[PDB]
């Protein structure tokens, strides 16, 4: 695995497409930890392999606005 | 016998209690390590957990998220503290673990939640160093869908001229609030910066601990829930202004302390911002 990232899709990716990019992300070996549904921001957060990444960083703008490491925040 | 926390009264909400306003059917989520439900002087609405390891919201393993609930809605009865909006309806959505640390991804989706069960006011006293691009698209949505968003401006200190605030405090469309004590004068952990938008009090905060405990607490993330139980004040008031109307008079009816950079526009005052 590459790490944990979060995905944001462009809005004007189908819900197809959304759904065929996570099972994707599973199918290469990643997992899929959270999906994000509302209304201007469609995403996921989980597990990429490393062929995963690469293929979302470049597509961005595309399919792609965004793609991030999955920080961490505390209480403190 | 009932306590009010010196904070309470500092940002003078008691005045506002006695004209009948307490944060009656303001939602307010407190995006935290949880809220223990059985507290005597708590009352939970409802919410939901985001930590894979922790499903269960209402069970507060770290005490940090029980403490930043209690000041914002402790019940006003004969026991405890007090609450800045005691009558406010608390959801925990938690967010953080029993070590009080949390995935990015895992707060999104509880901001998510939030959006998705009507939230007025979102309070988070957490933070990170690293910026994010979702965290970001996240605490915009949640504002463009009309929640007030607070959250705590970190406890780095100064750094020079440089900004100390963290993340998501440091985003344009959140309230970052900072602390000072019971004199007004800024916690010397208090971050600073231009990010920085007001002050509350966050130094030895007594509130509600996990299993019927009450304790002081230092941190802007004992601020923060002040001005989000502020806000709930305000909007049982005038149940028809916008987030933005909310933020605009809480801003702009605050008592001006020191500079900017270290104390934003200053202590707020929900009984002037009621209006
Ligand atoms: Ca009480």
Redesign the interface.
Known sequence: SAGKFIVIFKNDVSEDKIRETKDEVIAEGGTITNEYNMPGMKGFAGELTPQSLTKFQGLQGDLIDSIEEDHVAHAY | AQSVPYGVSQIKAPALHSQGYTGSNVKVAVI??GIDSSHPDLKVAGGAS?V?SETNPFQDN?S??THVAGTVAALNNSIGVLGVAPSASLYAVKV?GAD??????????GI?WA??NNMDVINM????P?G????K??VD?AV?SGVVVVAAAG?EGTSGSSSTVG?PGKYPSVIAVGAVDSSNQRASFSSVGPELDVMAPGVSIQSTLPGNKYGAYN?T?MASPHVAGAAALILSKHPNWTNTQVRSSLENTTTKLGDSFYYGKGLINVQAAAQ
């Open positions: 935290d390590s985001m894979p770290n940090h998220g953080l009080g640390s949390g995935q990015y991804s895992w707060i999104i989706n998510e959006i998705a006293s957490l933070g990170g690293s994010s691009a979702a965290l698209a996240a949505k463009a406890n993340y941190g993330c």
